Every structure is written in structure tokens, then in C-alpha cells.
Amino acid sequence: NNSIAIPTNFTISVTTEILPVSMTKTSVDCTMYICGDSTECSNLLLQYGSFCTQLKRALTGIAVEQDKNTQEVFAQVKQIYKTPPIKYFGGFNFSQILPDPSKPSKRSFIEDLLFNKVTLKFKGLTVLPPLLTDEMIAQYTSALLAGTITSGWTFGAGAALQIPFAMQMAYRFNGIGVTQNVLYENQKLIANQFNSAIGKIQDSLSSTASALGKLQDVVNHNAQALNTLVKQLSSKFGAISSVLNDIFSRLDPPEAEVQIDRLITGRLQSLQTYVTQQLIRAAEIRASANLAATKMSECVLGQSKRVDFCGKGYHLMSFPQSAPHGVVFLHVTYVPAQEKNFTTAPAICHDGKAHFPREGVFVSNGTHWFVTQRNFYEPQIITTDNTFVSGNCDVVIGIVNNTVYDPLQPELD
Amino acid sequence: FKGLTVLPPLLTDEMIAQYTSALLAGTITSGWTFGAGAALQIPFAMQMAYRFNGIGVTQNVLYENQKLIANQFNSAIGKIQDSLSSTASALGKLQDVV
Amino acid sequence: NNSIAIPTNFTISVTTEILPVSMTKTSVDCTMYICGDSTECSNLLLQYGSFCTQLKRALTGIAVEQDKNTQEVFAQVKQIYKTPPIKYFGGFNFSQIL
Amino acid sequence: LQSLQTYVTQQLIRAAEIRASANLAATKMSECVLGQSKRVDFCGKGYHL
Amino acid sequence: GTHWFVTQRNFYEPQIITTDNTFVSGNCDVVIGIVNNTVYDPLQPELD
Amino acid sequence: YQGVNCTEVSNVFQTRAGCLIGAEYVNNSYECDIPIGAGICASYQTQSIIAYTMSLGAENSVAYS
Ligand SMILES: *[C@@H]1O[C@H](CO)[C@@H](O[C@@H]2O[C@H](CO)[C@@H](O)[C@H](O)[C@H]2NC(C)=O)[C@H](O)[C@H]1NC(C)=O
Ligand SMILES: *[C@@H]1O[C@H](CO)[C@@H](O)[C@H](O)[C@H]1NC(C)=O
Ligand SMILES: *[C@@H]1O[C@H](CO)[C@@H](O)[C@H](O)[C@H]1NC(C)=O
Ligand SMILES: *[C@@H]1O[C@H](CO)[C@@H](O)[C@H](O)[C@H]1NC(C)=O
Ligand SMILES: *[C@@H]1O[C@H](CO)[C@@H](O)[C@H](O)[C@H]1NC(C)=O
Ligand SMILES: *[C@@H]1O[C@H](CO)[C@@H](O)[C@H](O)[C@H]1NC(C)=O
Ligand SMILES: *[C@@H]1O[C@H](CO)[C@@H](O)[C@H](O)[C@H]1NC(C)=O
Ligand SMILES: *[C@@H]1O[C@H](CO)[C@@H](O)[C@H](O)[C@H]1NC(C)=O
Ligand SMILES: *[C@@H]1O[C@H](CO)[C@@H](O)[C@H](O)[C@H]1NC(C)=O
Ligand SMILES: *[C@@H]1O[C@H](CO)[C@@H](O)[C@H](O)[C@H]1NC(C)=O
Ligand SMILES: *[C@@H]1O[C@H](CO)[C@@H](O)[C@H](O)[C@H]1NC(C)=O
Numbered sequence: 001n002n003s004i005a006i007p008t009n010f011t012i013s014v015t016t017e018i019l020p021v022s023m024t025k026t027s028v029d030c031t032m033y034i035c036g037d038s039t040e041c042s043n044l045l046l047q048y049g050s051f052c053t054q055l056k057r058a059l060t061g062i063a064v065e066q067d068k069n070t071q072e073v074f075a076q077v078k079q080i081y082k083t084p085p086i087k088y089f090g091g092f093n094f095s096q097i098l099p100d101p102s103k104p105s106k107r108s109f110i111e112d113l114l115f116n117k118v119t120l121k122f123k124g125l126t127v128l129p130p131l132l133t134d135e136m137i138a139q140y141t142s143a144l145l146a147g148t149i150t151s152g153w154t155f156g157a158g159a160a161l162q163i164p165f166a167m168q169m170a171y172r173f174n175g176i177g178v179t180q181n182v183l184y185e186n187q188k189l190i191a192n193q194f195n196s197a198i199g200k201i202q203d204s205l206s207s208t209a210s211a212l213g214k215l216q217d218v219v220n221h222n223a224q225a226l227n228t229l230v231k232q233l234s235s236k237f238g239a240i241s242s243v244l245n246d247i248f249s250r251l252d253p254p255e256a257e258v259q260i261d262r263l264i265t266g267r268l269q270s271l272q273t274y275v276t277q278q279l280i281r282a283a284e285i286r287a288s289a290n291l292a293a294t295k296m297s298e299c300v301l302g303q304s305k306r307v308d309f310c311g312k313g314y315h316l317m318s319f320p321q322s323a324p325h326g327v328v329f330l331h332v333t334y335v336p337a338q339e340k341n342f343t344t345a346p347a348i349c350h351d352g353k354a355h356f357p358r359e360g361v362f363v364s365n366g367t368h369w370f371v372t373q374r375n376f377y378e379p380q381i382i383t384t385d386n387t388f389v390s391g392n393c394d395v396v397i398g399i400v401n402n403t404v405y406d407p408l409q410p411e412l413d
Numbered sequence: 414f415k416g417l418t419v420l421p422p423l424l425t426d427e428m429i430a431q432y433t434s435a436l437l438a439g440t441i442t443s444g445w446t447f448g449a450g451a452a453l454q455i456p457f458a459m460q461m462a463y464r465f466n467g468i469g470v471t472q473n474v475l476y477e478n479q480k481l482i483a484n485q486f487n488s489a490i491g492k493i494q495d496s497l498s499s500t501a502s503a504l505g506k507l508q509d510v511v
Numbered sequence: 512n513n514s515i516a517i518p519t520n521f522t523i524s525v526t527t528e529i530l531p532v533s534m535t536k537t538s539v540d541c542t543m544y545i546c547g548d549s550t551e552c553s554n555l556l557l558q559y560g561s562f563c564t565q566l567k568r569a570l571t572g573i574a575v576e577q578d579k580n581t582q583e584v585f586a587q588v589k590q591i592y593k594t595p596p597i598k599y600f601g602g603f604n605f606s607q608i609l
Numbered sequence: 610l611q612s613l614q615t616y617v618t619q620q621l622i623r624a625a626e627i628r629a630s631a632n633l634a635a636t637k638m639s640e641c642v643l644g645q646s647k648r649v650d651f652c653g654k655g656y657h658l
Numbered sequence: 659g660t661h662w663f664v665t666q667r668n669f670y671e672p673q674i675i676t677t678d679n680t681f682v683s684g685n686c687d688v689v690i691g692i693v694n695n696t697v698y699d700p701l702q703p704e705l706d
Numbered sequence: 707y708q709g710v711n712c713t714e715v716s717n718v719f720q721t722r723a724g725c726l727i728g729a730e731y732v733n734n735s736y737e738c739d740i741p742i743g744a745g746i747c748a749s750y751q752t753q754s755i756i757a758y759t760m761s762l763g764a765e766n767s768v769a770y771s
Contacts, residue, residue, distance in 0.1 A: 228561060228564075228565065231560075231561060232560050232561065235558070235559060235560035235561075236558050236559075237558075237559060237560070238558070238559075266559075266560070270560075273565070308587075397601075
């Protein structure tokens, strides 16, 4: 009937998300793969038409798409913001996410563990280097961290505007529906919890065996595709031998033409299958990259009100980190804890009038009614300042009798 | 056969129904609290008053039209059954997949 | 430029949305489908390379994807909540959905 | 072999489409069932409750 | 037609215009279309 | 020439993507016009073909207090 539970404490938490953004760029030459160092076969290969042009166009498109994905995900900011030399932010410690001052590679320590944890001119098969180097992506990430720490969400919607980090956290608590004094009397506790959570993420990433499986998946898929493409080159495909020189040597040209055609057909089919699988995988990776860019904008540059988009709990802020083929998000959220039961009422009947809370809920403490906010237990005396009156006491089901204090009442003179 | 077989899904329909029942019970009994941490109970009338405050309408509107709102919800839920039953192409997408 | 319209009543409505979540898991047999369980053909079939491993890998990946889809959609709740035995929620009829 | 390869390719394309639909369904669950959504026409026509 | 009230946008609940539901911002010769009316002060009748 | 150390077969410049012949390397940084690879882009000087390292953006520092 009239039971409600309100949390009396909270625990702020940090969680990790891994998202692939791009895959390797591969280029394939037909003649070398199908039949290389043999101009005799090269003469016959031209008879099949424009298959090579189609294959090269498809590979070039899915190679350009990777640079497009990386640019879309990481080049969100227009200017390279720099962190102040004094790394004091009201008790919050960002040493594990900011770049290392000793400058071994201009990477944060967590980024170092990410780059160490995940592994990262063949027979006609080549790989192309990505347009953006790891240093440039790390620089973009550093700019994003500096902007989101120094200015808040203002830098992502216009000119960058500085604000102390404590006041930014007060803004964010106001955003999640909790008053700012809750931060102002618990700043030290919140800073300690944040530092402990960052340390726990450090240890969990250092210790987990299969935390970064989503990038190993892409790397292994590319490796197995290339390996099976090379392995298929040794199959007979119905000919007497898999060596083109051998079939030229051991048979007459008119009879060897059929076996050459069989080899050509088999190798072309295998290469076409490779291209099709690459196209499908590229589509999947493009969808993942679009998701990563959307998450970057929503969670890093702002504060999303969507439920589970930026981690479990009420979202406060997020921090991006770089990975060899993806991005890593550290979502800081607010989780209530230590809840207590009270008995509640929908309205207060006073002087034949129904009073409703303005921005809170009625709780009774058993024998004394108060007004408190929903997400944190903080009782207060019911007055006319925090309640509004509308209607009589006969329309509301469950109304209860109590007195409403009038601030101007004691001023009788 | 000709070598073409079908594998059974890991989750049976009973398990999915159990998950759905858990979600319904949580959302009816605790609002949106169960999806963000510990599940905190709250009377349904107050939860719906909060949900009216969420769309820009004051809660006294609900506290004065509770019976009407309940009747409208009940009529809509009752009509959903007939709407699904009578329509011959309501579940067209799943049939298309099959 | 000096006229507005403000509603004086309201109607609450319930609508249905249907979304496919998964499809059928299928398996294939190379020798049974192609060679028809004939010994002469099987020896010739292994000469064509590693196409069958590719097909088996693809179908296995599809099946695991279907299972992951179902788990992602339906297993979002940590605990199995239970509704109270006294099903009175201030005038509402959830019998059609419980 | 060509017939079986064609079947596999069509199955892969359909699996990708079904995966997209399942991701949409999961997002709908998280944002409409576990909370109240302010996005327009995402959880039905009207002001979502 | 004759009197002026304040209502919430999504529902018709007329209220008397007071100092509680209104805030003052500058003089009344800049806003285009501003009209003439009285604002009720609940404090004066009490005379604290 | 992709993947070739062009110490083997006007200005000649060596890149991680390959060896570039006919483009002059300049130490200024501009926005990318023609992406070559490994962070090096090329453009028309306006007059000649030049190669350079792309610039991510303008440097900025917010006065945090
Ligand atoms: C607002 O609309 C509702 C819905 O039509 C009205 O409730 C109906 O009122 C009539 C006449 O009293 C009854 O015959 C119906 O049974 C009611 N419907 C339901 C679902 O209860 C309500 O009267 C309207 N209110 C105003 C002020 O216009
Ligand atoms: C249950 O609680 C509600 C909320 O106060 C109240 O309006 C209703 O009358 C109660 N019903 C019973 C049977 O106690
Ligand atoms: C921040 O944390 C690191 C590692 O825990 C520690 O070495 C450093 O001293 C901390 N910062 C301050 C200002 O104490
Ligand atoms: C709610 O908390 C109170 C403590 O104030 C306790 O006495 C009561 O048994 C609790 N009820 C439930 C259902 O947990
Ligand atoms: C709240 O309840 C406790 C126990 O019932 C009581 O001791 C206390 O005085 C109450 N609070 C106030 C402000 O009276
Ligand atoms: C509240 O007090 C009034 C008298 O001021 C009385 O008529 C009414 O019955 C009381 N309400 C309850 C629930 O006892
Ligand atoms: C309102 O619209 C009418 C018709 O166009 C126009 O004559 C009048 O000037 C407008 N009022 C204002 C205040 O602009
Ligand atoms: C609520 O609606 C269901 C659906 O028809 C009905 O069976 C049930 O009796 C109703 N509840 C009550 C308490 O009558
Ligand atoms: C409003 O009242 C003021 C003084 O009371 C007067 O000067 C002004 O002309 C009035 N405006 C209109 C539109 O009547
Ligand atoms: C090309 O060879 C020279 C000398 O052997 C070497 O210094 C240089 O690093 C090589 N280039 C690449 C891209 O490896
Ligand atoms: C660029 O810098 C290098 C390194 O000193 C130098 O050798 C080269 O001449 C410079 N080129 C131009 C165009 O300044």
C-alpha cells in the first residue's frame, strides 16, 4: 500500500567497454596469385574479362572505408587542447589516464597495457599502412581528455569554457537528479571512491585473461582468411598436378589447356570468396565504428540520459582510451546503496486542502512526516515553500492528515 | 535427409518466458529503479504520478483522475487482445523469417 | 500571432511493436549432399581443397551469433524478480500480461 | 559446390540483417522498458509513459 | 476573453497570476505584444 | 612504389608506405589533400608536388584555475 525505499548512501563506479573501429587494409594482385612467373598463363588469364578490376575496386573501397571509420571516430575535436602543468583537480587523480610525463611513447599507462595485451609482401598478398599512426590517435585522445577535464561539456558545443572540476561534478549530480550540496559535503569521499575505482580498473585490465577478445577476434579472422587463401593455391582442382610448370612439362598444350582452365577457375573462385567475406566483415566493422562514434559524442562530449548507453547506473562522465584497432571507454556512473524503508503518502491534507510535494516525496519516519528527494535520503520540515496546494481533501485516495508549517506565521507582529 | 539438419536453440521458450516475467515483475513493483542498481519498491500510483511529471504534466492530474486513467488503460489492454487476434498480418515479420 | 490551443482532456493508448531477434540454426554435410554417400566420389571430393571447412566455420559462427542475439536481448536482468501474491496495483488490470 | 556456396553467402547476409534487428530490439528494451524515454516516436506514438 | 490566467502547456489548469508563478525581467517597453494586467501579491493582504 | 626500399630500383623520399619519386618533402604541416599513408600527405604547392606530415589541428590551451 504505502511502502517506499530510499537509498541513504551511494557508490560511484567505473566500467570498461571495448569496441573495434577498423581492420587491416589488404591489396591483392591477380596474376601473381593465380599464376605468377608464367607469361604463358598470363596470356590466357586476360580472356576472362574484367574480374580483376572488380576485385581491385572492392578491395580499394573497403580499404578507404577503414580510414573513413577512424577519422569519423577519433577526429571529433577541432583543436588540440592541453592539460595545465598543475595536475590538481580538487582531489581527483587522473594520472592513470593522462599521458606519461616521462614521454616514452606519449601514452597513458592504461593505454600501455592495452597496447601490450593485444597482438598487432606475401605471395601476391600485401597489407597497407593506415593513414593515422598510433601517435596521432593517442594525441587525439589526449586532446579529448584535456578538453573534457578542463572545460566539461562546453568544449564540444562551441567555445571551450573553463570551470573548476568540483563545480562540474556538482553540475553532473544536478543532471542525474541529486542536489549539489550532496557533492559539496562528500567531495573527499567521492574523490576517494573515484581513485579506488580507477585502481580497480587498472588491476582488472592487467589481470583478466580475455578482456580484449573483441580485437583478437578481428586479427585472427584476418589471419585465417589470408592463410586459407594462400593454402588453397596448392589444391589440384581436378588437374593432374597443382604446379603449372609441371603440367606444362608433362603434357601437350592442347590437352594442358583444359587443366590450365580448371586451375584458373578454382583459383578465381577462391579469390572471389575471399573478397566477398571481406566485404561482409567490412560492413560489420563499419557498423561497429558508427556505434563507437555515436558513443564518443554522446558519453564523452556530454551526459546521456539514455538508460544503459553509457554503462550501468546513472551516467556522470566517460573517458576515452586508445587500442590498436579500437577504442576503450571508461564510464563513471552513480549507483545508490544502503536503502531504507519508510511509509509514504500521496498528499498532505491541511486546512481542508491537498498539498503535493514540488520536487520530492513524502516520508513518515514512522511518526513524523518529512519531504525528501527521491535518489538520496535527506528529510526536511514540510512547509509552504516546498509544497503546492491544488484541490480539496476529498478527491485524493490515500491522503493523510498533518500540519504544514508557514514560514511567515511566526512574524505575527 | 540430404545432409541438412537443424540445431535446437540454447534457450527454451520457457526460459525466455521466465526472463520476461522477471522483467514485468521488476518494472511493475519497482519502477525504473531495478535497472540502475538496487530495486526499490514504490506504489504504482506514485510511480505513474512520477511518469506524468516526466512528460510535463503535474501529478495532481493523476491523483484526481486515477480512476479514469485506470479504466482507459484497462480498455486499451483489453482491446490489444482483439487487435492482435483479428489482424491476419500482425506477426508478418517472424512468419517472413520462418 | 495571438492565439493558442490547449488540450482539456487526454487519452492513454497502447500500441504493439514486433521485432525479430533470431533465426534458425542450420548445419550442412558436404559428402552427404554432394557425393550422395558414394565412395568413388568422396576420394575425388577431398581433392578440391578446404571449402568444407570454410562452410562449417561460417555456419557455426551464424549459430553462435543467433545464441548471442537471444542472450543480449532477453538476459538483461540480473535477478529473477517475483510479483506479490496479492495482485492489486491501485485499479490496474495486468492479468493479460502476467 | 557452387549451389552450396551461394546458400552460405545468402545465410551470412540474412544473419547480418537479423543481428541489426536484434541490436535494435535490445536498445528498445533498455530504453523503453527499464526507463522512460524522451526520444520522439522511439517507444510509440505520443508522450511515452 | 475577459480575464488572464496561467496554465501549464499540456493541460488546461487556469491559475491566478501571482508573484509566485511569474518573474520580473526589465521594463515593459521592449517585449513586442506585452499587454496590460494586474499581478496579485499574496503577501500584502496578510500584512505581516 | 609500395613496400619497396628504393635504395633498390626529381626528389626521392622514403616513407613507411613506400618510396616516393617526384615529390619534395617540406617540414611545414598542412591539412591532408592527397593521403599517401603512414601520416604523410601530398598536395600541389601552387607550382610543384610537395609531401608533408598532416596537422591534426590548431594548438590550444585552456586557462584552468
Ligand atoms: C475525458 O475523456 C474521457 C474518455 O472519453 C471521458 O470519460 C468518459 O465519460 C463518458 C461520459 O461521462 C463515459 O460514458 C465514458 O465511459 C467515459 N470513458 C471512460 C474510459 O471512463 C471523460 O468524461 C472526459 N472528460 C472531460 C472533462 O472531457
Ligand atoms: C492500499 O494503499 C493505497 C495507498 O495509500 C490506498 O489508497 C488503498 O486504499 C490501500 N488499500 C487497502 C485495501 O488497504
Ligand atoms: C595519483 O595516483 C598515483 C598512483 O596511485 C600516485 O602515485 C600519485 O601520487 C597520485 N597523485 C597524487 C597527487 O598523490
Ligand atoms: C523495511 O525496513 C524497516 C526498517 O525501518 C524494517 O523494520 C522492515 O522490516 C523492512 N521491510 C522489508 C519488507 O524489508
Ligand atoms: C524519527 O523517528 C525516530 C524513531 O521513531 C525518532 O526517535 C525521531 O525523533 C524521529 N525524528 C524526528 C525529527 O522526530
Ligand atoms: C483529518 O482531519 C479532519 C478534521 O480536520 C477529519 O474530518 C478527517 O476525518 C481526518 N482524516 C483522517 C484520515 O482521519
Ligand atoms: C499578426 O498578424 C497579422 C496578419 O498578418 C498582422 O497584421 C499583425 O501585424 C501581426 N501582429 C504582430 C504583433 O506582428
Ligand atoms: C483485471 O483485469 C483482468 C483481465 O480481464 C480481470 O480478469 C481481473 O479480474 C481484473 N482485476 C480485478 C481485481 O477484477
Ligand atoms: C498600459 O498602461 C500604461 C499605464 O498604466 C499606459 O501608459 C499604456 O498605454 C497601456 N497600454 C495599453 C496597450 O493600453
Ligand atoms: C630501407 O633501408 C635502409 C637501409 O637498409 C633502412 O635504414 C630503412 O629503415 C629502410 N626502410 C624501411 C621502411 O624499412
Ligand atoms: C626538412 O627538414 C629536414 C631535416 O633537417 C631537412 O633535411 C630538409 O632539407 C627540410 N626541408 C625543407 C623543405 O625545409
